[PDB]
Design a protein around this motif. Structure first.
Motif, short mmCIF file in Angstrom:
data_model
loop_
_atom_site.label_atom_id
_atom_site.label_comp_id
_atom_site.label_asym_id
_atom_site.label_seq_id
_atom_site.Cartn_x
_atom_site.Cartn_y
_atom_site.Cartn_z
N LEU A 1 -5.60 -7.67 -1.83
CA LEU A 1 -5.24 -6.35 -2.36
C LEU A 1 -5.17 -5.32 -1.25
CD1 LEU A 1 -4.94 -5.04 -5.40
CD2 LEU A 1 -7.17 -4.07 -4.87
N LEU A 2 -6.00 -5.49 -0.23
CA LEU A 2 -6.07 -4.57 0.89
C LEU A 2 -5.11 -4.95 2.03
CD1 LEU A 2 -9.96 -4.45 0.86
CD2 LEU A 2 -8.55 -2.54 0.11
N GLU B 1 -11.45 -12.99 -2.34
CA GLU B 1 -10.09 -13.28 -1.90
C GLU B 1 -9.08 -12.36 -2.56
OE1 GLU B 1 -8.88 -17.40 -2.32
OE2 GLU B 1 -6.79 -16.86 -1.91
N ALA B 2 -9.25 -12.13 -3.87
CA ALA B 2 -8.36 -11.27 -4.64
C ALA B 2 -8.39 -9.84 -4.11
CB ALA B 2 -8.72 -11.31 -6.11
N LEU B 3 -9.59 -9.34 -3.84
CA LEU B 3 -9.76 -8.01 -3.29
C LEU B 3 -9.34 -7.98 -1.82
CD1 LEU B 3 -12.39 -6.34 -1.59
CD2 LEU B 3 -10.60 -5.11 -2.85
N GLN C 1 -6.65 0.52 1.10
CA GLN C 1 -7.72 0.63 2.10
C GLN C 1 -8.31 2.03 2.15
OE1 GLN C 1 -6.43 -1.01 6.01
NE2 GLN C 1 -4.89 -2.13 4.83
N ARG C 2 -7.55 3.01 1.65
CA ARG C 2 -7.97 4.40 1.67
C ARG C 2 -9.23 4.62 0.83
NH1 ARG C 2 -7.39 9.51 -0.78
NH2 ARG C 2 -7.14 11.18 0.77
N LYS D 1 -2.62 -2.67 -12.32
CA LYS D 1 -1.64 -3.73 -12.60
C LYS D 1 -1.49 -4.69 -11.43
CE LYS D 1 -0.14 -1.42 -16.44
NZ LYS D 1 -0.78 -0.20 -17.04
N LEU D 2 -1.63 -4.17 -10.21
CA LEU D 2 -1.47 -4.97 -9.00
C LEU D 2 -2.61 -5.95 -8.80
CD1 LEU D 2 -0.32 -2.10 -6.56
CD2 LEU D 2 1.16 -3.55 -7.97
N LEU D 3 -3.84 -5.51 -9.10
CA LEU D 3 -5.03 -6.35 -8.91
C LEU D 3 -5.10 -7.52 -9.90
CD1 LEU D 3 -7.67 -6.94 -7.35
CD2 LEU D 3 -8.79 -5.22 -8.78
N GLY D 4 -4.67 -7.28 -11.13
CA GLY D 4 -4.52 -8.35 -12.12
C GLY D 4 -3.45 -9.34 -11.69
N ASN D 5 -2.42 -8.83 -11.01
CA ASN D 5 -1.37 -9.65 -10.40
C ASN D 5 -1.89 -10.51 -9.26
OD1 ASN D 5 0.63 -8.83 -12.16
ND2 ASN D 5 1.85 -7.74 -10.62
#
Ligand code: 5DP
Ligand code: HEM
Ligand code: HEM
Ligand code: HEM
Ligand code: HEM
Ligand code: O
Ligand code: O
Ligand code: O
Ligand code: O
Lengths: 145, 140, 141, 145
Positions: free
Chosen positions: D30-31, D25-27, D38-39, D103-107
């Motif tokens: 993120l996309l 869900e987190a990943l 997504q790149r 930083k965004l993924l930890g968010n």
């Protein structure tokens, strides 16, 4: 960090730099271009217009000091973490300056160099200085890293 | 963007004039030399020193920028086709845009020193940021 | 810049928030001061002790401001002109804090609305708040 | 990084976390939220709409692999830099991922954790986790700074 060839030319160019004149312009332009940084310098007097900023005596006197810390760090390129160790602790505990703002000032300094040297500040000579101002940027954020 | 900003950007890009093509070519060379990870967005390109491709490509950017300067009030509408590419197709990381923003502001500094005033510096940075935001937005 | 789809998602999401705007507004700051201590420095005059009455009275202000922005998504600058007078020219608030509040707000909405906080809405609100944030940080008068 | 009191509740909560459901869900988000990510997953298949991104099988299977290394970092909390030296090198030297995206993924993780636990994930408990993600992100950005 830099190599031997990168280092020698970065030193050569910096010799032609006038410490007094470049420091005031950089800090000024930092406060003009990124105006949220003006809160940190409320004590400096008047900051209403860009002309009042670029002529403020406290601003210009302080810009000279930051460039002196930059000149010093240029002599210690082998170890920027230890050279900017003191100021690093200052910007965190006493000032709460966000580490992101160092990137902007490093970038401003580069633009300020380019204006005052035109073509003499070659695209290759710029790229080598991009390693320096980013190398410094990390050293002042080593409490946050 | 303020009323003085819009005026400054116009006056600055007017001083650029017909030179923009070369400046678009420099702004590129300065990016591909300073931030080598950006060179991965152009794998098909020939990124040699003073390329025919790069020089020709820099001409496309500056021309499209000129369009942005003339369409300061409706940037989303004018750059709708460029957004299709940069956002939907290419999927460019926003930090690259900021890096082109900084690279271009260097080119304009070195070439136009009398005109690159702190007032104009802040305006061009605020303009490029707003153009970057359009191009990294999927509004279709 | 938002899609029509982004604006629909935002309008629907806030239609589900309803009267609990003040509750989440207050919770957002409560989370911000605790999660990121530096954001207390803009509030030296505030009471910041857990469950403060001042923070709860102030959280309602923020949520009352965001609810106007939803009504005027096609004119965020005009609607929020007076709030840019404060946050940008007067208080001179660092834009990095705006990322921290929006993150603290997005977490709040996620905890209370796990049925309505879908990834499709997540993106739209992230864009929405970053557009409010841009307005409040820019000097345009 | 954390104190002794801040280690206990962060670990006790982590045991209740489903590493498969949250990971995918987190990943996923993120996309969706940050589309330019997504790149990095061109090989992964259809990532055209919010439905496709969330139900992509490679996305979900790779989602757990992340949260497992995150779960690995939950044990080695003091030596995060040492535990992530392999993954910090890979993500820049090969995959050229910008240190800001970490930083965004930890968010995103926190947001998903708050969505999955609701009130069980309190303002105070979040604060302890915000340091954890900010330590793992900084450990993964170590090859830069
Ligand atoms: C930065 C990040 C980091 O990891 N370090 C290493 C050290 C860890 C930092 C730490 O110990 N933090 C705990 C919280 O901070 C307490 C600091 O120790 C207390 C002494 O410093 C405080 O004294 C001054 C002066 O009395 C305080 O400043 C007052 O006035 C200013 C005016 O602008 C502020 O608005 C207010 O915070 C305060 O009323 C301030 O609290 C100092 O922290 C890092 O260094
Ligand atoms: C390139 C990175 C930077 C370097 C190398 C640097 C260097 C310095 C130096 C040498 C001083 C004087 C130390 C003293 O005598 O107390 C100083 C003080 C200060 N700096 Fe920085 N600085 C940097 C970036 C910043 C940024 C981005 C800000 C925030 C906008 C900032 C805000 C301040 C403030 C508020 C003071 C104290 C002002 C005073 O008491 O007069 N600095 N810094
Ligand atoms: C706001 C600044 C930018 C502007 C005005 C801009 C504009 C353009 C234009 C006019 C083109 C040519 C379109 C065509 O093929 O006809 C283009 C292509 C392209 N741009 Fe950008 N762009 C910007 C930012 C960026 C950045 C920062 C990057 C990353 C380095 C990037 C990556 C690309 C790529 C990969 C192409 C395709 C090249 C090709 O196949 O010919 N863009 N852009
Ligand atoms: C989503 C973006 C934000 C919105 C919509 C917002 C909204 C508001 C509102 C409605 C007020 C009340 C003004 C009044 O009538 O007194 C206010 C005040 C204030 N805000 Fe914000 N705000 C935002 C972001 C921030 C951030 C990130 C900070 C920094 C932590 C900040 C710092 C302040 C300060 C220092 C005040 C003055 C407190 C007082 O009333 O004495 N704002 N804001
Ligand atoms: C919280 C921060 C992050 C953590 C803990 C993390 C962890 C991981 C892990 C465990 C792997 C699997 C490597 C292996 O099996 O040996 C991986 C792969 C990868 N990561 Fe990260 N990552 C983070 C941030 C990011 C971000 C934000 C991106 C950009 C979208 C990224 C890009 C990639 C790519 C392209 C791969 C390879 C995919 C594959 O071929 O399997 N990383 N990461
Ligand atoms: O400074
Ligand atoms: O470009
Ligand atoms: O606020
Ligand atoms: O990843």
């Amino acid at each position: 960090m830099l190599t031997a060839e990168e280092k020698a030319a970065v030193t050569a160019f910096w010799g032609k730099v006038k410490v007094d004149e470049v420091g005031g312009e950089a800090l000024g332009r930092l406060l003009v271009v990124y105006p949220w940084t003006q809160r940190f310098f409320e004590s400096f007097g008047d900051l209403s217009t860009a002309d009042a900023v670029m002529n403020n005596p406290k601003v210009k006197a302080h810009g000279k000091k930051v460039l002196d810390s930059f000149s010093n760090g240029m002599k210690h390129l082998d170890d920027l973490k230890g050279t900017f160790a003191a100021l690093s602790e200052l910007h965190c505990d006493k000032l709460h300056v966000d580490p992101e703002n160092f990137k902007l000032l490093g970038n401003v300094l580069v633009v300020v160099l380019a204006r005052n040297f035109g073509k003499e500040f070659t695209p290759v000579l710029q790229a080598d200085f991009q390693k320096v101002v980013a190398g410094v940027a990390n050293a002042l954020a080593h409490r946050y890293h | 963007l303020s009323a003085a900003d819009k005026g400054n950007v116009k006056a600055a890009w007017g001083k650029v004039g017909g030179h923009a093509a070369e400046y678009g070519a420099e702004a590129l060379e300065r990016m591909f030399l300073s931030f080598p990870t950006t060179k991965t967005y152009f794998p098909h390109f020939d990124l040699s020193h003073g390329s025919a491709q790069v020089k020709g490509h820099g001409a496309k950017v500056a021309a499209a920028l000129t369009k942005a300067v003339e369409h300061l009030d409706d940037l989303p509408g004018a750059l709708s086709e460029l957004s299709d590419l940069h956002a939907h197709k290419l999927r460019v990381d926003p930090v690259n845009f900021k890096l082109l923003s900084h690279s271009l502001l260097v080119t304009l500094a070195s070439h136009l020193p009398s005109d690159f005033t702190p007032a104009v510096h802040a305006s061009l940075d605020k303009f490029l940021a707003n153009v970057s935001t359009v191009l990294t937005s999927k509004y279709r």
